[PDB]
Chain length 364, copies 4
């Protein structure tokens, strides 16, 4: 029955209108400065970068989405085999459903069978830490796919509007997560799920030892929309309230700025509405180490292996065109390339006390 | 005949297009910062707060609207009994009509019969203070409903365009109000009626002893539109002039800032176009002690008791979602939560000498 | 034939779409701060003010438009008799046509027959000063209507696009104007004609003794558009060029700021797209001494005396509404009332070095 | 092969929708301040200016476009003979095609036969410098048309999306350019091609001795769009990627500021979406020495000699109208005339560290 949410989630995400619904990444307020003399040739552009103890071919990852039933595993299988082929890391979807039901397990393990070398990232929700999950459940999530890291997701907005949601985010959870991390052999990433990570939340997680963040800002998949749709579907009164919250959250671009600023040494995934290699380039230039994507990977995967391969080919070409046209021979140069910040993003940073001088120095 | 006006007011506000007509709250310029780790659980959120010497369940009030005839009293009955059920304060409409006609009295008194515990707020207009009302009339308004406070409304814009209107706001009235307040056993609130309270107005009222304010800013019920409609209806020439004034006034959000800034210890109702618990959260976060609402309460009340009950359930849920998602365990924490101010509201504050640093400290 | 262009000007201005065509006054960036406690009564509001040596009932004037043929004089007759009834000053149209043709004279003189007490303002164009006009022609313009002042118009944008235009604006014209002003027994006002007065132009005129200005900024009657239509009509190639210039000039609001700032002691008419008594209030609050209007007066005058009477009644009502609602018992108080400046006007002032503190003090 | 590309470029530029496609010059953020007293007469305005060792009649040039086949030469012939008649300089299109194929030569030489006195500017692409071209090729391009200068184009964005493009911009190319310039008897201009010159690029070029720049900013011909169209036509996958890059580049107005700022003594052509004499005047007032145009000259030339004569007549009239209306007797006075800069261009300059005070002094 958690298993039908799982398919309903994928079905609404894949086929309903929830991508950027009434929301914004603020990435239109970021401009990469064009260099008419790049100083490089396209063919010498190098996109390799570090992902924990592995090297990856591109600074992009697929973030966690699904798992829990065999048709969901077939999607994970297509994503994982193509991610392997391209040398990109892949997070799986929440593994709760496979801690609760042994028959859900293969729909996650298939990822590692088909992708033996790339970084694979486990996944469990914060609310499960408040309800009993502890070290052993983390280790089971991890071994089930021989993960190189585990992502713990924050989705309080989703849970608030979810018909059968669990909006429990007591501080005790962080004490538990900090303890669990002492004992785990792989790092923890804390990621949002469409509503973004602010500086208050990043400093707080940081105070409990978390150094790896995934912004998942607003502007991309709108989980408040997804749950609004599930509410409409059951005639649940919450739907009209969800609609008032459609634009709730920290935009992706602002979240990247807030996390890089407030935790200058964090390992940062910039995600939530990254739809092109140009978006990916902007995310990294603003301050992320890697760009994350979920929804468009799902939509291509459902179309098939070849559609997904073409999708990555296009993302990668678009990333390298942005590096070419900013004179960035490598990911490190991209992180330092010249930008312009305009509009609401600029007003957001100013109000929030993001001194642009210190900002430029910190993103580099 | 003032009784026909009372009827025509309700009918135009309920059924014509005057909610936010050519006007704006500026609340879209206020963003509540999302906290992906709230640090609390939904179920522990506490919405109680003080309203003078009483405790109320939710920091929201229904502000004054109607009374004067038995159908108007049936509306007041429904609002009051639901307000009583939910532990929320209720203002009644202008009681002038019941000072002038004894047969109008029961349409107000019904409120206290059906709501014996909640704060009830009496109502008289400023222009009646310059025309002979004094202490006794205030006391009669109060005792008629065993009121816990009396609201004196400012409606000069309305009066100017009213067919019918009395635009008399001589300073003598304030002298009289200050004198009356010496003798009254309950507090006075001064409220606008759709065009908002500016800093010069709030400082002037304060200089005469007024400490309780209700912004009633523009962007909600447009009273200049309502009178425009009454002018059209009678082929009165003033209609075309009212139309040029549709966007006149201080936007709610700016008014909240101006009042809180210029009278930092004021008790503040933030109202005028509050249409969701999210709007209510923003109002409180910006500087108000409570959020006030009138028009959407009227619309639900007209549909009936159950519709009105559902409306409050939804407002309260939305308020709590916004507290949850900012990590606000209680009203006091919401007042201090992180915000961003952008766009025209930012420009309005800057031009008016609202130093944002000092604003932050003052709102807390 | 000059007589024909005068006919054609009125016809295009009255009947074609040239009011505010692709242009803006920037008055939407000026907000008058609402005072919910005005401290006054509508009936005590005083709108009297000084116009040179006379008193006028309202701080509004009708600016120069027409004259030159008998049907044009019938329009001047109607405007003048209504202006007399209301105690408002009236400028006449360029009197060149009546210096050149004695039969054109009565169409100006009728103004003074019918309006024996109000200020009447004569009119000649700056280009004529470089083409032979001097003292005697000014004195002839003045005595023809026993004028209390003479306006000299600037219209270089119009003359550039006019099929038979004279774009001659040699500095010698100012030397001549300065000399003439020594000898004249009435004051000179220099007025633009839909393209506005900048600070450089105001300071230059001031250096030659000019102390009285009429901004005639962009956003109201678009004279470039008028000449563009005349060019289309004659298949003149210039029409396409005029179209690129439709939005050329200083917006009225900016021009009022520029002139009041750069010449703090000037006598200032704020005009160019004043369409309501609210616009008129904003213009005075921004820095003008009086609001000027031309096109809407022509349109009403063409419809008849009673239409024109109704029009002034509405402007006056709207002006007094705005004074009531800002707590302005008189014109002097309106000049000092609180405002907000936002948007492009704000950015215009900042780029042009208009320090807002010193601005606030100067407008007063 | 390349001859076919040359024909398809002209056809797509002339007849498809690529002029300003999803892009912007930012010239709408530049306002020339109107001067109601210009202090000059239209007939005394002088538009002459220097272009290296020649005098040209108007501060406008036609920038390089075509050549390579006899129908392309017939367009070159028409533009050249009209340019000659008007005293305006003309660049030819890339001469690569005529270095590779001797039959393409006459389509360039024709320009000098028909325009013996005006400056003619040769053209080669920067990629060819890394691919074997050097002094001799430059000298051939120059003698082929007895050029007064040679433009070297930057088009890395075009090359990236061009189906058969060569994105090779190694620093060695600049080393070679600098060496060539020692030996050449005419100056070098470095020009972009629709995507604009940033300060980092201008400083880098300057460091290798280049002092002559042509902004060719985004907002006019969109070469990324043109190549997108060629990719669509060939079902080449890159088209979808080009589409994501449609708004890539430095807007013309921003590029003019960046170059004039970071290289104050540069000789500077402002181009990329100059469509009227008004645009031309803005470009010069902002900091360019001359305004450049390509696409609208092509579309006129294709209609014929008389159409192109009419086009120039219009551009020059518009330019002079803008001088007239700013009080600019000559090109030098235009470069110093008062402007306002607003909106995104203002935010762009602030973010990029362009101090407006120092900007003003340098643009003069
Ligand atoms: C269908 C599907 C389902 C999930 C997701 C999304 C998608 C589309 N996402 C959130 C996802 O990883 C990502 O953070 C957000 O979707 C923002 O990225 P995009 O805008 O989708 O690129 C998500 N995140 C998570 O941490 N655990 C989960 O199980 C899921 N589930
Ligand atoms: C039908 C009706 C009639 C009244 C009002 C409202 C409406 C809708 N309001 C104004 C109300 O108290 C509130 O200040 C404004 O309407 C702004 O709130 P809303 O935007 O309507 O939530 C009101 N104000 C008051 O002080 N005395 C009054 O009698 C009236 N009457
Ligand atoms: C039909 C007509 C004819 C003229 C004008 C206007 C109109 C509408 N105006 C310009 C006028 O006085 C005013 O400066 C502008 O029209 C801007 O004000 P409005 O936007 O029209 O209110 C004008 N100005 C002036 O100095 N002498 C002239 O003779 C003319 N004639
Ligand atoms: C048909 C065509 C062909 C060419 C171009 C343009 C056009 C439209 N342009 C670029 C051009 O010179 C100019 O920099 C840009 O087109 C921007 O100016 P416009 O917006 O077209 O005025 C160009 N530039 C150049 O240096 N060498 C050339 O071969 C070409 N070819
Ligand atoms: C976007 C995201 C985190 C989806 C998981 O939602 P959920 O609450 O259904 O996950 P779980 O299965 O962990 O409860
Ligand atoms: C919004 C508002 C204050 C309505 C009451 O106006 P009114 O002038 O009809 O009230 P009263 O009956 O007190 O004159
Ligand atoms: C708007 C305005 C000033 C019109 C008079 O133009 P004009 O050039 O025809 O006047 P004159 O008859 O004085 O040339
Ligand atoms: C806009 C511009 C510079 C066009 C020349 O393009 P190209 O790559 O076809 O030129 P070349 O013939 O020099 O390769
Ligand atoms: Mg969950
Ligand atoms: Mg009243
Ligand atoms: Mg004239
Ligand atoms: Mg090339």
């Amino acid at each position: 029955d958690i298993v039908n949410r799982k398919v309903e989630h994928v079905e609404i995400a894949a086929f309903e209108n929830v991508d950027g619904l009434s929301s914004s990444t603020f990435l239109n307020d970021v401009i990469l400065v064009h260099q008419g003399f790049p100083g490089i040739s396209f063919s010498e552009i190098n996109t390799k970068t570090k992902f924990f103890r592995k090297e990856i071919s591109v600074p992009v990852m697929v973030t966690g989405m699904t798992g829990g039933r065999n048709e969901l595993g077939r999607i994970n299988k297509i994503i994982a085999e193509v991610a392997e082929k391209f040398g990109i890391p892949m997070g799986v979807g929440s593994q709760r459903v496979a801690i609760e039901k042994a028959e859900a397990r293969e729909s996650f393990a298939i990822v590692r069978k088909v992708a033996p070398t790339i970084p694979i990232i486990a996944n469990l929700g914060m609310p499960q830490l408040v309800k009993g999950y502890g070290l052993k459940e983390f280790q089971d999530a991890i071994q089930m796919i021989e993960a190189d890291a585990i992502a713990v997701h924050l989705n309080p907005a989703q849970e608030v509007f979810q018909p059968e949601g669990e909006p429990e985010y007591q501080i005790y959870a962080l004490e538990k997560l900090r303890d669990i991390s002492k004992e785990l052999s792989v790092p923890i990433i804390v990621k949002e799920s469409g509503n973004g990570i602010s500086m208050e939340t990043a400093k707080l997680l940081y105070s409990y030892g978390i150094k790896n963040f995934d912004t998942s800002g607003q502007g991309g998949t709108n989980w408040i929309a997804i749950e609004m749709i599930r509410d409409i579907r059951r005639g649940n009164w919450k739907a009209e309230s969800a609609k008032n919250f459609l634009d709730w959250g920290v935009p992706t671009a602002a979240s990247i700025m807030e996390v890089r600023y407030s935790v200058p040494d964090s390992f940062l995934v910039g995600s939530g509405g990254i739809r092109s290699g140009l978006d990916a380039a902007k995310a990294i230039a603003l301050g992320a180490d890697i760009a994350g994507m979920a929804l468009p990977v799902l939509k291509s995967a459902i179309e098939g292996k070849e559609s997904l391969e073409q999708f990555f080919r296009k993302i990668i070409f678009e990333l390298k065109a942005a590096m070419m046209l900013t004179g960035s021979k490598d990911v490190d140069a991209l992180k330092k390339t010249s930008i312009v910040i305009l509009g609401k993003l600029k007003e957001w940073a100013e109000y929030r006390g993001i001194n642009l001088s210190i900002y430029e120095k910190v993103r580099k």
